[PDB]
Structures are given as structure tokens and as C-alpha cells.
Design a protein around this motif. Structure first.
Motif, PDB file in Angstrom:
ATOM      1  N   UNK B 104       0.853  -1.182   0.000  1.00 20.24           N
ATOM      2  CA  UNK B 104       0.000   0.000   0.000  1.00 20.24           C
ATOM      3  C   UNK B 104       0.890   1.234   0.000  1.00 20.24           C
ATOM      4  N   UNK B 105       0.604   2.170  -0.902  1.00 22.35           N
ATOM      5  CA  UNK B 105       1.347   3.415  -1.000  1.00 22.35           C
ATOM      6  C   UNK B 105       0.383   4.592  -0.952  1.00 22.35           C
ATOM      7  N   UNK B 106       0.895   5.737  -0.508  1.00 24.15           N
ATOM      8  CA  UNK B 106       0.102   6.948  -0.369  1.00 24.15           C
ATOM      9  C   UNK B 106       0.862   8.130  -0.952  1.00 24.15           C
ATOM     10  N   UNK B 107       0.109   9.157  -1.338  1.00 27.51           N
ATOM     11  CA  UNK B 107       0.691  10.342  -1.935  1.00 27.51           C
ATOM     12  C   UNK B 107       0.178  10.606  -3.335  1.00 27.51           C
ATOM     13  N   UNK B 108       0.162  11.864  -3.739  1.00 29.81           N
ATOM     14  CA  UNK B 108      -0.312  12.234  -5.055  1.00 29.81           C
ATOM     15  C   UNK B 108      -0.839  13.655  -5.049  1.00 29.81           C
ATOM     16  N   UNK B 109      -1.486  14.013  -6.148  1.00 30.09           N
ATOM     17  CA  UNK B 109      -2.050  15.334  -6.326  1.00 30.09           C
ATOM     18  C   UNK B 109      -1.239  16.164  -7.304  1.00 30.09           C
ATOM     19  N   UNK B 110      -1.636  17.429  -7.422  1.00 35.14           N
ATOM     20  CA  UNK B 110      -0.935  18.350  -8.305  1.00 35.14           C
ATOM     21  C   UNK B 110       0.486  18.584  -7.809  1.00 35.14           C
ATOM     22  N   UNK B 111       1.427  18.649  -8.750  1.00 38.92           N
ATOM     23  CA  UNK B 111       2.831  18.812  -8.386  1.00 38.92           C
ATOM     24  C   UNK B 111       3.156  20.274  -8.113  1.00 38.92           C
ATOM     25  N   UNK B 112       2.741  21.175  -9.015  1.00 39.81           N
ATOM     26  CA  UNK B 112       3.124  22.581  -8.953  1.00 39.81           C
ATOM     27  C   UNK B 112       4.643  22.677  -8.861  1.00 39.81           C
ATOM     28  N   UNK B 113       5.365  22.450  -9.985  1.00 43.01           N
ATOM     29  CA  UNK B 113       6.819  22.207  -9.944  1.00 43.01           C
ATOM     30  C   UNK B 113       7.591  23.015  -8.913  1.00 43.01           C
ATOM     31  N   UNK B 114       8.368  22.310  -8.094  1.00 43.23           N
ATOM     32  CA  UNK B 114       9.041  22.903  -6.957  1.00 43.23           C
ATOM     33  C   UNK B 114       8.409  22.453  -5.657  1.00 43.23           C
ATOM     34  N   UNK B 115       9.024  21.478  -4.999  1.00 37.95           N
ATOM     35  CA  UNK B 115       8.459  20.919  -3.786  1.00 37.95           C
ATOM     36  C   UNK B 115       9.093  19.573  -3.480  1.00 37.95           C
ATOM     37  N   UNK B 116       8.422  18.822  -2.605  1.00 36.90           N
ATOM     38  CA  UNK B 116       8.900  17.513  -2.179  1.00 36.90           C
ATOM     39  C   UNK B 116       7.997  16.384  -2.659  1.00 36.90           C
ATOM     40  N   UNK B 117       6.709  16.423  -2.317  1.00 34.84           N
ATOM     41  CA  UNK B 117       5.754  15.369  -2.661  1.00 34.84           C
ATOM     42  C   UNK B 117       6.299  13.999  -2.242  1.00 34.84           C
ATOM     43  N   UNK B 118       6.441  13.851  -0.928  1.00 36.94           N
ATOM     44  CA  UNK B 118       7.052  12.661  -0.347  1.00 36.94           C
ATOM     45  C   UNK B 118       6.083  11.485  -0.413  1.00 36.94           C
ATOM     46  N   UNK B 119       6.484  10.426  -1.110  1.00 37.86           N
ATOM     47  CA  UNK B 119       5.711   9.196  -1.192  1.00 37.86           C
ATOM     48  C   UNK B 119       6.244   8.174  -0.195  1.00 37.86           C
ATOM     49  N   UNK B 120       5.371   7.249   0.203  1.00 39.48           N
ATOM     50  CA  UNK B 120       5.735   6.193   1.135  1.00 39.48           C
ATOM     51  C   UNK B 120       5.139   4.875   0.663  1.00 39.48           C
ATOM     52  N   UNK B 121       5.829   3.784   0.985  1.00 39.47           N
ATOM     53  CA  UNK B 121       5.387   2.436   0.653  1.00 39.47           C
ATOM     54  C   UNK B 121       5.292   1.618   1.932  1.00 39.47           C
ATOM     55  N   UNK B 122       4.167   0.931   2.113  1.00 39.56           N
ATOM     56  CA  UNK B 122       3.911   0.129   3.301  1.00 39.56           C
ATOM     57  C   UNK B 122       4.040  -1.349   2.959  1.00 39.56           C
ATOM     58  N   UNK B 123       4.799  -2.077   3.772  1.00 45.35           N
ATOM     59  CA  UNK B 123       5.024  -3.503   3.584  1.00 45.35           C
ATOM     60  C   UNK B 123       4.334  -4.278   4.697  1.00 45.35           C
ATOM     61  N   UNK B 124       3.566  -5.300   4.318  1.00 41.40           N
ATOM     62  CA  UNK B 124       2.852  -6.143   5.276  1.00 41.40           C
ATOM     63  C   UNK B 124       2.969  -7.589   4.807  1.00 41.40           C
ATOM     64  N   UNK B 125       3.827  -8.359   5.471  1.00 40.60           N
ATOM     65  CA  UNK B 125       4.008  -9.756   5.128  1.00 40.60           C
ATOM     66  C   UNK B 125       5.449 -10.123   4.847  1.00 40.60           C
TER      67      UNK B 125
END
Ligand SMILES: CC(C)CCC[C@@H](C)[C@H]1CC[C@H]2[C@@H]3CC=C4C[C@@H](OC(=O)CCC(=O)O)CC[C@]4(C)[C@H]3CC[C@]12C
Lengths: 315, 217, 98, 85, 299
Positions: B104-125
Motif C-alpha cells: 500500500x502506497x500513499x501520496x499524489x495530487x498536483x505537483x506545482x513544480x518545486x516541492x517535495x511530494x514525499x511518497x511512502x510504501x507500506x510492507x505487510x508480510x
């Protein structure tokens, strides 16, 4: 099938091997079979010789003091090749009538392929040459003898000590490479003592012997806990520790698996049963003192295919 | 390694035999992973000879530098795009599509160039010490593109040639979570990111893929 | 290395190794199958051709021209390769033959 | 007597390479007499001494190992003196 | 001054000069070669530093050799005086004791390395090696101390001789015995015992296992060391019997030069049997791989 081959300088000799890794089954060893291809006229008044030997490198300096050669051989085999198996017979049909099969067997009570990072350690090497019996007229190959996890889980580890009472017991013995270790520690702290910290560490013990038995004390992973236990209070907690080759770099003498040619290999697997290197793993729990050692076996699982000869991602 | 596939978009009936050909450019060894994408891609064939633990209809053959995928029995639940990959070097290259334990991963939306937009990945198993985490990109109307990879056992941080510098891969190694730090985003990075998992020691291929998060600039 | 096969539509030119006291051979794979051997050429004296291409196929080599000319019914349609008899050099590619 | 003979042989040895004397002594050592002829040999018209004269088995004439020549008959071997040591 | 002190008191001599000349001919080039590569070319390790120091000692010893050659080749008429014989004797004793200590510590290190690997690369540090070398050098310095203060030059029937002069009465007898016994204990008993115990224990450990050349070189080194210093030490001990009991002073008039020649030959051949013989060593004066692929297979 995709057999693996290596040639020689000036295109004089070429050897074909079905596989470069041989598995020890604790009762038999996979035969080292193959086929050598020779130039049609390079053998006049000469005989092709294929030799398999085990090399135990144990030092590298700038001068031998009296006679110390810095390299001892544990097993030496020789084949001339002037019933065939189902592998080398197919190679004869593919190559032709100028190919001569060679058969080798690995005797028991022999060390596995182990390399010590700075290639010191035990290595298996194959030489193919023709002479009337240089490095530019012979074929040099390196092969690995490895063992995988057995089918017997074994008894559950357990060890207790008192001086304060400490009890530790791992869930099992067979741990795969990269699998975290779940250890449970129970303390009583009868009276007149108070532990400042809880220390759990994993150390690698390698049994190297050439003239006398020697032991290594090389910690792999160390975990420190700030929990404190007061007198007449019980404390139970499960800690997670896992060996990994990330913070263990730059540690000279660390036991690693056999390296073919400057490759990347994980920690050396535990040796299960001699002159060579025997690798064992233990878990040390210290209270701050009382020390409890919990031996365990760290082996790869049984694979369904031949392991790669190098790291899958190159460069 | 540039990788092109001779078929582009074929049509077949229920009882036809769909054949897909994959051609390399540097004489790659017997290391090819076949993925079927309708949703997250699913791995069918690894090492071009072995079958993933998918029906037995899918078969893989090696003929040197050319790799062939044979169905030999088509099914109505087979309309998807197939990609060819070589896991021999760090810059793994995916092929072109041929139209015919959870992450399961989270994050997204408009970028508006210039920023971080930190994504994460969840591991289960599964853990991170025994399994690598790979991040890939998929622009709309385009094939997969691997951008980053992390190996917690060895501490290696691999980045693509056109993605290195502006991207950063990290692993928590405690909560079994993986993250991708992205900076200096451009208009050419608008693609769906798929968190991928693969066994670290025996990199047989990206077994389980994430749900994917849309990232538009 | 740098195995650049010519002819077709047959000569091979090597750069790393030399034709001194070595045997070079030509390999035709198949219409649709694995590799096979056609003919070889040692330093001189024993040409040792095969049986199927015998009479129909010849072979020659020059130690100074740095090239190997193979000289040549409808089954000879495949990709021809030039390599050492012990198959030491990396396998190249042949243009075509028909 | 013995002292006169010792003085005469010491003078002969010195001239080979008179004045009055001022000291004389005799020794009971076997096979000789250790005479300590402490005197002077101031010469005029050239042709303080410490002649430690001992057939004479030694002549320690100087003009300070006279104990060695006195004890000589019983060894005249210097320690070492056959190697660099 | 006329300090004349007159009194009334061979093939074996020529062979000593032959041995001296032979050792001088071979000793200097070998020591120079060992110095040049160990000191500058080869890497600085414990073994390299120890062999470099031993070669320095041997080089100084053979550089002060020709003074002794002039001393011995003319029936002992030392034409240098009093300020040179003492210095030469002190330097020779320093060099020989340093060499003996270096060989015995090399044997100790070899035994420790090949028997006790548990503590072999923990205390063996270049700083510790330097401390050991300094300790050995200062021990050899303040162990030949009486050789720079006791020697004196006198006349011996038209021959000037510089000798130990162990008469600086009652003290004459005790001083002669103490110095020779101390030299025998620290130069022939303790080092030889250490070399024997270290080497034999190594052989016993190796014997309970499965190189042939390693035993032969050790045996050759041991026998070469034994047969050379033994005559010198035995003749030095025999000097005490002359002063203590009756003696003829005949056998010692020629045995000492031969013993010194044997010792000098041993010093010359120590580089031969230690450094100048190993197989790897000769390789660099002569000066001064394919890739693994794969193929197909029919089913
Ligand atoms: C058996 C004979 C032939 C000696 C030659 C074998 C060597 C290859 C072995 C013997 C002793 C070993 C060493 C023993 C002590 C050290 C330090 C050790 O570091 C630690 O103990 C943990 C940190 C510390 O306490 O300093 C790691 C292994 C290492 C390098 C070992 C490296 C390999 C060695 C040199």
C-alpha cells in the motif's frame, strides 16, 4: 541448459561446465563433471591434464620468512582424459570428437567455499592444461561448494543463567539470510542490583585451524536498550536483531561466502557436520554482569535454480 | 540496453496462439522477466524458463538474444499488455507493450513544480532486509521505467541515469516502510509510480506490485 | 573481440587474437535450431572438412591479410559465424546467406 | 749481585734501542729475583726509570704491569688478545 | 719512552683468512641488496623492519671487518692505537648481540604466529615492533659496555696488542669469569634454547597434520647456527680454565681465529638462508585472464 565455459589465452583450451556451484547433501557431494575442448593440433607429443585442488589462503605479506608459503593445499586431484553421465555426453555431441570429458569427485570432510573480506579463505579452483608431464596456456576456474538449510528444524534454543536471573530463548534455530531474529528475554532482578541497560548482540565465531585451533570474536549486529529494571520487578520484552552487510563493512577478517571474481557476497553460512574454516553464529545477551549465549544456524533456503555467478544488478 | 518487441498490437480469437517476441541489444544472459498488465502488472515468467507460482499455459523460450513468449491457449481474461525486462544490469530496461501480502502506497495530487511530494510504501508480510524495494514510472501511453531501487542488506542506492540527483530513496528498516524523496520535479516526470518488491539475494523479478499512485504535474 | 563478419547477402576479421598457430572454423547454426560446425582450418596441412558440406564448401585463410575466406543446395540458408575451433572469441553476427 | 746484574742488563737493553740508583728490593720468588730498580739514567755525551727486571725470564723496563713479570716463571698470556671480542 | 716489555714465551691460520675474505666477498652484496629492497622498495611490515635492522647490524659488522682483517693477518701488530680498538670491539659486540637477538625474536614471532593465531595480529603492531627493536638495540648497547672501558694496548715482544685487560688482583679473577659467563648465557644458551624449543614445537604441531620445504630450511638454519657459534663460545669458556687451573695455551693459539671465521661465515649466510633463498624473492629480479562466457545445449 546454458552451460558455462571459460577459454584460455591464445585460444588453445576451453572447458565446459554444467554448473559452477556444487551442493553438499551431508551424505554425498555433486560430482564436478565437464568437458574440455582442445585445439585439433596443440597436443602433439603431449597429454591434456585437468587438476582440481582446494586452496586455503592464510596470509599475504611482502616476504616469506623461512619457508612459509602463505598458501596450503587441502586436497589435490588430477585427471588425464587422454560411464559418462547425461550432461557431458550431450556436450560431446555438440562439440565433436575433439572433446574429452573429465570427471571429478569431492571427498567428504572438506571445507565449504568461504572468503575473508579485506581473497583469504578456502577456495576451489580448476586448472586445465596440456603438457608432456604457464598462465598463458592454462584455464583458471573457481567453483563454490555450498550447503543449504536442512529439513530438520531442530530443538528450540534455550539458555538460562543466574548470579539476578536471566532467561533467553530464540523461537527456532534455522534462520534464513536476512530474516530478523526474534528473541525473548525474561528477568527477575531478585534484589540488590539494578540493570542500567539491556544489551543484545550477535557475534560470528569462525573455527579456523591449520596447526592449532583458533577462535574469532567478531560482532555482527549490536542492539542497545535504555530500559531499566528495578529490584523485585519482572520485565519481559521481545527484541528484533538481524545480521546484515551494511554496517559490517571495513571489518577485516569477517567471514563471507565464496567470491568468484571480486563479487559481493553476504555473511558466511553456518557450517554443519577438519582442516579449514568452520563458521558458527551465537546471540549474546548482557545485563548491566551476566552473559547468555544462544547458538543458532544461519543457512540459505533450498533453491529451485542455480544461483547467479555475481550480483544480479551489475554496476 | 535498448529493447524492442516486433509485435505492437495484435488481435486473436479464443482458440488462437498469441506469440510475443523480445529482442535484446547487448546479448543479455538467461534473465528475462515477463509482466502482464491490464491494474498492477503481474509477473508470469522469470528466467525465461521458469514458471511463477499463474497457469501452465504461459511458456518461455530462449533462442540467444531473442526471447519468445508463447501462450498456446488464449483465454478471455488475457486482454492486457505484456512487457519484457532484463535483470542483468542496474539500469533495467522494460520493453514495449503488446495489446491483444499486499503493498500500500500513499501520496499524489498536483505537483506545482518545486516541492517535495514525499511518497511512502507500506510492507505487510515481508521484511526489508531480505527483500529489495523498487520504484518504477509509467507515463500515460508509455511503458514502464525504473527510476530507483534500494537494498537494505547491502546499503546500495541505485538511481536511473536521467533520474539520479533529483531523487532519493530511503528505507526505515524498522516499520518496514520505504520512501522516495523527489525534488526539482519537471513536467516530464508526470507518471504513475508503482512500488515493487523483489527478493534481495535471488533477484528473480518484481513479484508483488503496489496499487500505484497518480502523480501529475 | 570486434568480430566483424563480412560477405553474404563470407569473410571474418579479428582484432584481438591472431591466426598464428591456431585453428579457425566457420559455424552455421540451422534454419531454425542451435549451432553447428561447417569447416575448420589449422595453421596449414590438415584442412579437415566435414561430411555434409564436403565438395560443396571450401575454406582458406591468410596469416597476413587478417581475414578468413570461406568459399561455397537450398538447405544452406542460415546465419554463418566465424570463430576459433575451441570457441574462444565472443560470438559475432552474420549478415545473411541464401 | 742480583741487583747489580739486573741494573746492568736493564742498561744494556736501554742502550740497545750512568747514574746512581735510589731503590732496590729482592723477592723470594722461585727461579729468579724480582728487582725493582727505580733509578735514573741521566746521560752525557749520548751514545727516572722504572726497570722491572726479573737468564732473565722477562724485562719490564720503562724510562705498569710489573706484577705480571714478577709472577711470571706462572703465565704470560694476556686475556683475550686472540679475537676482537 | 722505551716501554719495551720483552720476555721469554700455518695452514690453520691461512684458512681463517680465506674464510674472512670469502665472507667479506659475499656478505656486502647480500646485505646491500637486503637493505635496498626491505628498507625502500618492499612494504614496511614487522618482518621487513626486523630484517632491515638485522641487515643494518650485519652491514656495520662487515664494514668494521677489514680492521680485524688487518689486525689478524700480520701476527697481531694492531696499528691503530687505543681510541680505535675499543670502538671496534664495542661495535662488533653490539652488532653480533643485536643480530642474535633479532634471530631469536624472529623465531619467537614465527612460533607465535604459526601456533597461537588467537593473539597474533592484536599485539603485533608496527609501533610495538619499533619498541621491541629499540629495546633490543639499547640492550645490545648497554651489554657490551665493559668492552669500551676495559681494553688496553701493550707490548708483547715487538708486537702491539689491544686486549681486554681484566686487571683493573682480587677483582682480576672475578671480572674475567663474570663477563664471559654472561656472554655465554645471553648469546649462546638463552637464544639457542629459544630457537630449539620454538622450532621443535612447530615441527611437532605440523607433524600432527597433512610443507616439506618448510622443515628443511628450518633444519638448515639451525645446523648453520649451531656449528659456527659453538667453537667460539667453547673457546671463550676455555679461556677461564687457563687462569683457574693449569693449561698449555697451545690449542687456543689457533682455534679462536677459526671460530671467529666460522661465526663471520654464519653472519654472512644468515641473509642467504633467511631472505636470499625464498622462491618468491627471486621472481622480481627476473623482471628487474579470460572472461567466463556461456553456450547452448541441445535437449
Ligand atoms: C592459523 C595461521 C595460519 C595464521 C593465519 C590465519 C589468519 C588468516 C587468521 C589467524 C588470526 C586472525 C585474526 C584474529 C584477530 C582479528 C581482529 C578481529 O576483530 C575483532 O576481534 C572485533 C573488534 C575488536 O575486538 O578489535 C577480526 C578478525 C581478525 C582480523 C582475524 C583476521 C584473520 C586471521 C589473521
Amino acid at each position: 541448459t546454458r552451460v558455462f565455459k571459460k577459454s584460455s589465452p591464445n585460444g588453445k583450451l576451453t572447458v565446459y561446465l554444467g554448473k559452477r556451484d556444487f551442493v553438499d547433501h551431508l551424505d554425498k557431494v555433486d560430482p564436478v563433471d565437464g568437458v574440455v575442448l582442445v585445439d585439433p593440433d596443440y597436443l602433439k607429443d603431449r597429454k591434456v591434464f585437468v587438476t582440481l585442488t582446494v586452496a586455503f589462503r592464510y596470509g599475504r605479506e611482502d616476504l616469506d620468512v623461512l619457508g612459509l608459503s602463505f598458501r596450503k593445499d587441502l586436497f589435490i586431484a588430477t585427471y588425464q582424459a587422454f560411464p559418462p553421465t547425461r550432461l557431458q555426453d550431450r556436450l560431446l555431441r555438440k562439440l565433436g570428437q575433439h572433446a574429452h570429458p573429465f570427471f571429478f569427485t569431492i571427498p567428504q570432510n572438506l571445507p565449504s567455499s568461504v572468503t575473508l573480506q579485506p581473497a583469504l579463505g578456502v577456495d576451489f579452483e580448476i586448472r586445465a592444461f596440456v603438457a608432456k608431464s604457464h598462465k598463458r596456456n592454462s584455464v583458471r576456474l573457481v567453483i563454490r561448494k555450498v550447503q543449504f538449510a536442512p529439513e530438520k528444524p531442530g530443538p528450540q534454543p534455550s539458555a538460562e543463567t543466574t548470579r539476578l536471573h536471566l532467561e533467553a530463548s530464540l523461537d527456532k534455530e534455522l534462520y534464513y539470510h536476512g530474516e530478523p531474529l526474534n528473541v525473548n528475554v525474561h528477568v527477575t532482578n531478585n534484589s540488590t542490583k539494578t540493570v542500567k541497560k539491556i544489551k543484545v548482540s550477535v557475534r560470528q565465531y569462525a573455527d579456523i585451524v591449520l596447526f592449532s585451533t583458533a577462535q574469532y570474536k567478531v560482532p555482527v549486529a549490536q542492539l542497545e536498550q535504555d530500559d531499566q529494571v528495578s529490584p523485585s520487578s519482572t520485565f519481559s520484552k521481545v527484541y528484533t536483531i538481524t545480521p546484515l552487510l551494511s554496517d559490517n563493512r571495513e571489518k577485516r577478517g569477517l567471514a563471507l561466502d565464496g567470491k568468484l571474481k571480486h563479487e559481493d557476497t553476504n555473511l558466511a553460512s553456518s557450517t554443519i557436520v577438519v582442516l579449514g574454516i568452520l563458521v558458527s553464529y551465537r546471540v549474546k545477551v548482557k545485563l548491566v554482569d551476566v552473559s547468555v549465549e544462544l547458538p543458532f544456524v544461519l543457512m540459505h533456503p533450498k533453491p529451485k535454480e542455480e544461483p547467479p555467478h555475481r550480483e544480479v544488478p551489475e554496476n | 540496453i535498448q529493447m524492442t518487441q516486433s509485435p505492437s498490437s495484435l488481435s486473436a480469437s479464443v482458440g488462437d496462439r498469441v506469440t510475443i517476441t523480445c529482442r535484446a541489444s547487448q546479448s543479455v544472459s538467461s534473465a528475462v522477466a515477463w509482466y502482464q498488465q491490464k491494474k498492477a502488472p503481474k509477473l508470469l515468467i522469470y528466467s525465461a524458463s521458469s514458471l511463477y507460482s499463474v497457469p501452465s499455459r504461459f511458456s518461455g523460450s530462449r533462442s540467444g538474444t531473442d526471447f519468445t513468449l508463447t501462450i498456446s491457449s488464449l483465454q478471455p481474461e488475457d486482454f492486457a499488455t505484456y512487457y519484457c525486462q532484463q535483470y542483468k544490469y542496474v539500469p533495467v530496461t522494460f520493453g514495449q507493450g503488446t495489446k491483444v501480502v499486499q503493498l500500500v502506497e500513499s501520496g499524489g495530487g498536483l505537483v506545482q513544480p518545486g516541492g517535495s511530494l514525499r511518497l511512502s510504501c507500506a510492507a505487510s508480510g515481508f521484511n526489508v532486509y531480505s527483500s529489495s524495494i523498487h520504484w518504477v514510472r509509467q507515463a500515460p501511453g508509455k511503458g514502464l521505467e525504473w527510476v530507483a531501487s534500494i537494498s537494505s542488506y547491502y546499503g546500495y542506492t541505485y538511481y536511473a541515469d536521467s533520474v539520479k540527483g533529483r531523487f532519493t530513496i530511503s528505507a526505515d528498516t524498522s516499520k518496514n516502510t520505504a520512501y522516495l524523496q523527489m525534488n526539482s520535479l519537471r513536467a516530464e516526470d508526470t507518471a504513475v509510480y508503482y512500488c515493487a518488491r523483489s527478493r534481495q539475494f535471488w533477484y528473480s523479478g518484481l513479484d508483488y506490485w503496489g496499487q500505484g499512485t497518480l502523480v501529475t504535474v | 573481440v570486434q568480430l566483424q563478419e563480412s560477405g553474404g547477402g563470407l569473410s571474418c576479421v579479428v582484432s584481438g587474437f591472431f591466426f598464428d598457430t591456431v585453428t579457425m572454423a566457420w559455424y552455421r547454426r540451422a534454419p531454425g535450431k542451435h549451432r553447428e560446425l561447417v569447416a575448420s582450418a589449422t595453421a596449414g596441412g590438415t584442412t579437415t572438412y566435414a561430411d555434409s558440406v564436403k565438395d560443396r564448401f571450401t575454406i582458406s585463410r591468410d596469416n597476413a591479410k587478417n581475414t578468413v575466406y570461406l568459399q561455397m543446395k537450398p538447405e544452406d540458408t542460415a546465419v554463418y559465424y566465424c570463430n576459433t575451433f575451441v570457441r574462444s572469441l565472443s560470438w559475432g553476427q552474420g549478415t545473411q546467406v541464401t | 749481585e742480583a741487583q747489580r746484574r739486573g741494573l746492568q742488563v736493564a742498561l744494556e737493553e736501554f742502550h740497545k734501542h750512568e747514574t746512581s740508583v735510589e731503590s732496590a728490593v729482592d723477592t723470594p720468588f722461585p727461579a729468579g729475583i724480582f728487582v725493582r730498580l727505580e733509578f735514573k739514567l741521566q746521560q752525557t755525551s749520548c751514545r727516572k726509570c722504572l726497570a722491572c727486571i726479573k737468564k732473565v725470564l722477562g724485562r719490564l723496563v720503562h724510562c705498569t704491569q710489573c706484577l705480571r713479570v714478577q709472577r711470571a716463571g706462572h703465565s704470560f698470556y694476556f686475556p683475550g688478545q686472540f679475537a676482537f671480542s | 719512552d722505551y716501554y719495551s716489555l720483552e720476555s721469554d714465551l700455518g695452514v690453520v691460520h691461512w684458512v681463517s683468512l680465506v674464510l674472512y675474505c670469502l665472507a667479506f666477498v659475499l656478505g656486502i652484496p647480500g646485505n646491500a641488496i637486503v637493505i635496498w629492497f626491505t628498507g625502500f622498495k618492499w612494504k614496511k611490515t614487522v618482518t621487513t623492519l626486523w630484517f632491515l635492522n638485522l641487515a643494518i647490524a650485519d652491514f656495520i659488522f662487515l664494514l668494521f671487518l677489514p680492521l680485524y682483517i688487518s689486525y689478524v693477518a700480520m701476527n697481531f701488530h694492531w696499528p691503530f692505537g687505543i681510541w680505535l680498538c675499543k670502538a671496534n670491539s664495542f661495535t662488533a659486540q653490539l652488532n653480533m648481540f643485536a643480530s642474535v637477538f633479532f634471530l631469536t625474536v624472529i623465531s619467537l614471532d614465527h612460533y607465535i604466529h604459526l601456533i597461537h593465531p588467537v593473539l597474533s595480529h592484536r599485539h603485533r603492531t608496527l609501533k610495538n615492533s619499533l619498541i621491541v627493536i629499540i629495546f633490543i638495540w639499547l640492550l645490545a648497547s648497554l651489554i657490551g659496555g665493559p668492552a669500551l672501558y676495559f681494553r688496553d694496548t701493550v707490548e708483547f715482544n715487538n708486537h702491539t696488542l689491544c686486549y681486554n685487560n681484566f686487571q683493573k688482583p682480587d677483582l682480576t679473577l672475578i671480572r674475567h669469569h663474570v663477563l664471559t659467563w654472561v656472554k655465554f648465557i645471553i648469546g649462546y644458551l638463552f637464544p639457542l634454547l629459544t630457537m630449539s624449543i620454538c622450532y621443535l614445537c612447530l615441527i611437532f604441531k605440523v607433524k600432527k597434520r597433512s610443507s616439506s620445504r618448510h622443515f628443511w630450511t628450518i633444519l638448515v638454519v639451525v645446523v648453520a647456527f649451531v656449528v659456527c657459534w659453538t667453537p667460539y663460545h667453547l673457546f671463550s669458556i676455555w679461556e677461564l680454565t687457563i687462569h683457574h687451573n693449569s693449561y698449555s695455551h697451545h690449542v687456543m693459539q689457533a682455534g679462536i681465529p677459526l671460530s671467529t671465521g666460522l661465526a663471520f661465515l654464519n653472519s654472512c649466510l644468515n641473509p642467504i638462508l633467511y631472505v636470499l633463498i625464498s622462491k618468491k624473492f627471486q621472481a622480481r629480479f627476473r623482471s628487474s585472464s579470460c572472461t567466463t562466457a556461456s553456450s547452448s545445449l541441445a535437449k
